[PDB]
Design a protein around this motif. Sequence first.
Motif, PDB file in Angstrom:
ATOM      1  N   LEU A 192       1.060   1.243 -16.771  1.00 28.80           N
ATOM      2  CA  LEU A 192       0.370   1.982 -18.340  1.00 28.80           C
ATOM      3  C   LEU A 192       0.255   3.332 -18.059  1.00 28.80           C
ATOM      4  CD1 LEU A 192      -1.978  -0.877 -19.250  1.00 28.80           C
ATOM      5  CD2 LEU A 192       0.216  -0.247 -20.374  1.00 28.80           C
ATOM      6  N   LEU A 193      -0.405   3.846 -16.791  1.00 31.65           N
ATOM      7  CA  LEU A 193      -0.629   5.044 -16.630  1.00 31.65           C
ATOM      8  C   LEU A 193       0.754   6.014 -16.449  1.00 31.65           C
ATOM      9  CD1 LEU A 193      -3.300   5.190 -13.675  1.00 31.65           C
ATOM     10  CD2 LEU A 193      -3.609   6.291 -15.985  1.00 31.65           C
ATOM     11  N   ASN A 194       1.837   5.538 -16.200  1.00 35.94           N
ATOM     12  CA  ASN A 194       3.122   6.018 -16.023  1.00 35.94           C
ATOM     13  C   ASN A 194       3.730   6.081 -17.586  1.00 35.94           C
ATOM     14  OD1 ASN A 194       5.484   7.017 -14.597  1.00 35.94           O
ATOM     15  ND2 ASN A 194       6.429   4.842 -14.937  1.00 35.94           N
ATOM     16  N   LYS A 195       3.673   5.077 -18.340  1.00 35.36           N
ATOM     17  CA  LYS A 195       3.998   4.867 -19.580  1.00 35.36           C
ATOM     18  C   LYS A 195       3.565   6.245 -20.484  1.00 35.36           C
ATOM     19  CE  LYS A 195       4.783   1.959 -23.766  1.00 35.36           C
ATOM     20  NZ  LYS A 195       6.127   2.165 -24.231  1.00 35.36           N
ATOM     21  N   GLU A 196       2.144   6.276 -20.276  1.00 35.96           N
ATOM     22  CA  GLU A 196       1.661   7.190 -21.260  1.00 35.96           C
ATOM     23  C   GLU A 196       1.608   8.549 -20.581  1.00 35.96           C
ATOM     24  OE1 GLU A 196      -2.696   6.431 -21.897  1.00 35.96           O
ATOM     25  OE2 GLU A 196      -3.142   8.394 -22.312  1.00 35.96           O
TER      26      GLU A 196
ATOM     27  N   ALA B 176       0.868  -1.175  -0.033  1.00 36.04           N
ATOM     28  CA  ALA B 176       0.041  -0.211   0.066  1.00 36.04           C
ATOM     29  C   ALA B 176       0.678   1.100  -0.083  1.00 36.04           C
ATOM     30  CB  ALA B 176      -0.986   0.043   1.182  1.00 36.04           C
ATOM     31  N   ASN B 177       1.878   1.281   0.839  1.00 36.14           N
ATOM     32  CA  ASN B 177       2.968   2.289   0.906  1.00 36.14           C
ATOM     33  C   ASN B 177       3.513   2.512  -0.511  1.00 36.14           C
ATOM     34  OD1 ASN B 177       4.440   4.477   1.897  1.00 36.14           O
ATOM     35  ND2 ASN B 177       6.100   3.037   2.287  1.00 36.14           N
ATOM     36  N   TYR B 178       4.016   1.604  -1.187  1.00 40.05           N
ATOM     37  CA  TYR B 178       4.646   1.702  -2.505  1.00 40.05           C
ATOM     38  C   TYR B 178       3.505   2.212  -3.630  1.00 40.05           C
ATOM     39  CZ  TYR B 178       8.465  -0.617  -0.619  1.00 40.05           C
ATOM     40  OH  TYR B 178       9.563  -1.400   0.046  1.00 40.05           O
ATOM     41  N   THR B 179       2.395   1.639  -3.558  1.00 39.56           N
ATOM     42  CA  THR B 179       1.336   1.938  -4.606  1.00 39.56           C
ATOM     43  C   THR B 179       0.980   3.488  -4.418  1.00 39.56           C
ATOM     44  OG1 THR B 179       0.433  -0.298  -4.529  1.00 39.56           O
ATOM     45  CG2 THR B 179      -0.720   1.430  -5.474  1.00 39.56           C
ATOM     46  N   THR B 180       0.914   3.830  -3.119  1.00 37.97           N
ATOM     47  CA  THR B 180       0.218   5.201  -3.034  1.00 37.97           C
ATOM     48  C   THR B 180       1.429   6.140  -3.192  1.00 37.97           C
ATOM     49  OG1 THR B 180       0.887   5.298  -0.370  1.00 37.97           O
ATOM     50  CG2 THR B 180      -1.489   4.657  -1.228  1.00 37.97           C
ATOM     51  N   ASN B 181       2.467   5.777  -2.861  1.00 38.16           N
ATOM     52  CA  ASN B 181       3.786   6.807  -3.502  1.00 38.16           C
ATOM     53  C   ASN B 181       3.615   7.051  -5.070  1.00 38.16           C
ATOM     54  OD1 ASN B 181       5.059   7.490  -0.960  1.00 38.16           O
ATOM     55  ND2 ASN B 181       6.626   5.891  -1.085  1.00 38.16           N
TER      56      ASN B 181
ATOM     57  N   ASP C  93      10.172   2.594 -10.170  1.00 40.58           N
ATOM     58  CA  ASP C  93      11.033   2.182  -8.958  1.00 40.58           C
ATOM     59  C   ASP C  93       9.794   1.753  -7.925  1.00 40.58           C
ATOM     60  OD1 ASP C  93      13.362   2.949  -9.719  1.00 40.58           O
ATOM     61  OD2 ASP C  93      13.449   4.850  -8.612  1.00 40.58           O
ATOM     62  N   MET C  94       8.668   2.339  -7.709  1.00 39.94           N
ATOM     63  CA  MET C  94       7.679   1.610  -6.990  1.00 39.94           C
ATOM     64  C   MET C  94       7.056   0.496  -7.487  1.00 39.94           C
ATOM     65  SD  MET C  94       7.692   3.684  -4.260  1.00 39.94           S
ATOM     66  CE  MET C  94       9.424   3.951  -4.297  1.00 39.94           C
ATOM     67  N   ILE C  95       6.839   0.570  -8.622  1.00 38.32           N
ATOM     68  CA  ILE C  95       6.313  -0.694  -9.305  1.00 38.32           C
ATOM     69  C   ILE C  95       7.374  -2.034  -8.957  1.00 38.32           C
ATOM     70  CG2 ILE C  95       5.924  -1.776 -11.652  1.00 38.32           C
ATOM     71  CD1 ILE C  95       5.224   1.004 -12.515  1.00 38.32           C
ATOM     72  N   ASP C  96       8.802  -1.510  -9.425  1.00 32.68           N
ATOM     73  CA  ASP C  96       9.871  -2.677  -8.896  1.00 32.68           C
ATOM     74  C   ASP C  96       9.690  -3.430  -7.586  1.00 32.68           C
ATOM     75  OD1 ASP C  96      10.738  -2.286 -11.393  1.00 32.68           O
ATOM     76  OD2 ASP C  96      12.751  -1.718 -10.849  1.00 32.68           O
ATOM     77  N   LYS C  97       9.604  -2.110  -6.549  1.00 35.75           N
ATOM     78  CA  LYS C  97       9.061  -2.452  -5.097  1.00 35.75           C
ATOM     79  C   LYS C  97       8.075  -3.393  -4.789  1.00 35.75           C
ATOM     80  CE  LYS C  97      12.466   0.763  -3.621  1.00 35.75           C
ATOM     81  NZ  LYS C  97      13.409  -0.078  -3.799  1.00 35.75           N
ATOM     82  N   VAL C  98       6.894  -3.104  -5.457  1.00 36.26           N
ATOM     83  CA  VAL C  98       5.660  -4.201  -5.293  1.00 36.26           C
ATOM     84  C   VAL C  98       6.005  -5.244  -5.892  1.00 36.26           C
ATOM     85  CG1 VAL C  98       3.170  -4.477  -5.735  1.00 36.26           C
ATOM     86  CG2 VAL C  98       4.114  -2.098  -5.257  1.00 36.26           C
ATOM     87  N   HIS C  99       6.551  -5.475  -6.948  1.00 31.62           N
ATOM     88  CA  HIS C  99       6.875  -7.095  -7.593  1.00 31.62           C
ATOM     89  C   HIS C  99       7.798  -7.787  -6.789  1.00 31.62           C
ATOM     90  CE1 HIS C  99       5.846  -5.387 -11.920  1.00 31.62           C
ATOM     91  NE2 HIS C  99       4.847  -6.060 -11.517  1.00 31.62           N
TER      92      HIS C  99
ATOM     93  N   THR D 235      -3.118  -3.667  -9.886  1.00 35.58           N
ATOM     94  CA  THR D 235      -2.838  -2.495  -9.714  1.00 35.58           C
ATOM     95  C   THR D 235      -1.650  -1.953 -10.187  1.00 35.58           C
ATOM     96  OG1 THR D 235      -4.181  -2.554  -7.611  1.00 35.58           O
ATOM     97  CG2 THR D 235      -2.673  -0.658  -7.975  1.00 35.58           C
ATOM     98  N   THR D 236      -0.551  -2.732 -10.006  1.00 37.20           N
ATOM     99  CA  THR D 236       0.730  -2.213 -10.719  1.00 37.20           C
ATOM    100  C   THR D 236       0.827  -2.342 -12.197  1.00 37.20           C
ATOM    101  OG1 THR D 236       1.956  -4.554 -10.615  1.00 37.20           O
ATOM    102  CG2 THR D 236       2.241  -2.977  -8.780  1.00 37.20           C
ATOM    103  N   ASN D 237       0.171  -3.138 -12.919  1.00 36.90           N
ATOM    104  CA  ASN D 237      -0.281  -3.183 -14.353  1.00 36.90           C
ATOM    105  C   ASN D 237      -0.799  -1.802 -14.699  1.00 36.90           C
ATOM    106  OD1 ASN D 237       0.871  -5.830 -14.789  1.00 36.90           O
ATOM    107  ND2 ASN D 237      -1.150  -6.484 -14.920  1.00 36.90           N
ATOM    108  N   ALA D 238      -1.916  -1.574 -13.752  1.00 38.89           N
ATOM    109  CA  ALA D 238      -2.578  -0.176 -14.199  1.00 38.89           C
ATOM    110  C   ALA D 238      -1.594   1.013 -13.907  1.00 38.89           C
ATOM    111  CB  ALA D 238      -3.811   0.100 -13.334  1.00 38.89           C
TER     112      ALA D 238
END
Lengths: 123, 124, 123
Positions: C57-61, B49-54, C108-114, C51-54
Amino acid sequence: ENLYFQGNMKQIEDKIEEILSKIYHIENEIARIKKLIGAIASKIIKTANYTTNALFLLNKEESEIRDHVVEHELALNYLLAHQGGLCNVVKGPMCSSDIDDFSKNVSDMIDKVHEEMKKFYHE
Amino acid sequence: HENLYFQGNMKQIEDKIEEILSKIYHIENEIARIKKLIGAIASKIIKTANYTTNALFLLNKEESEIRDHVVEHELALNYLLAHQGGLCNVVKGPMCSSDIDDFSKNVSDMIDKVHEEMKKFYHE
Amino acid sequence: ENLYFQGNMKQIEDKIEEILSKIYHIENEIARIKKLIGAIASKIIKTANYTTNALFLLNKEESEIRDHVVEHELALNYLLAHQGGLCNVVKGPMCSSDIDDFSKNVSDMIDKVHEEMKKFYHE
């Protein structure tokens, strides 16, 4: 002496009373575990809900922004018609490169999160 | 006769109390591993949640800045195309004049709400 | 007497059938708790992935839109140069303001969720 049959019965009774108290401790902890798991489920739903709402609004706005930018590109090429358009005036190895529209793909992700959270209401 | 009937049944009772005690030992072990496993799940929820919200915060801030500039651009393009009916008349469509929603405060509100939910993990 | 010892022996055995029952109840409950926990873990993983796939995409565009808006600012400044640029014709305290590019920060945040989710495959 049959005093043995008194005492060994006593130890058995004592040990049963230990067993029942240990079962008591276990039972109360199971009630605690079940409670915490439901609280965790609740947090996952609430968090997923807020996150997907944020995703929805970023995505709706991104697409509206994109429409206006693509319109702006047309109009700027028009004003640069005699200079070979933006493709020739501002020139980059990715100048004419089109702008992806991932609004339906992001929408599809939002739908998949919503579908996952529907499943909590059965689990 | 009876002296052994008392004995064998007392032995059967005692030995069944050893089965129960060990059965309890194994339940206690599974309960401990469950509580640990719950602890780690809670931990991953907070971190994710922390990473996503960032990420959301950053997409939001940038989207707002981008919006601000597109607004300026439309204005400049409406100004430059003024003797042709503005931007609106030159690059037509049923949604040319459409305003651009600013959802930055609404997204920020969603960020706030996630942060609030995570705060609550620190109280259980 | 015999009837007393025997009658107490009966009371022991009755408690034993009651203990063994409560234990089996506990065991069944532990197995429904374990299944619940694994289903929850799987919901977290699926949900995070969508969520990270979303986000991706948002980030790329968003990054493409930004490159295009930046070009466009150069184009509009070139066009309105005989009038003081964009900084004069619309004149604001955030008119010439540089647009931030957080695409690497979002990746970076996407990497961290993965990475966090990859860890579920170990527990």
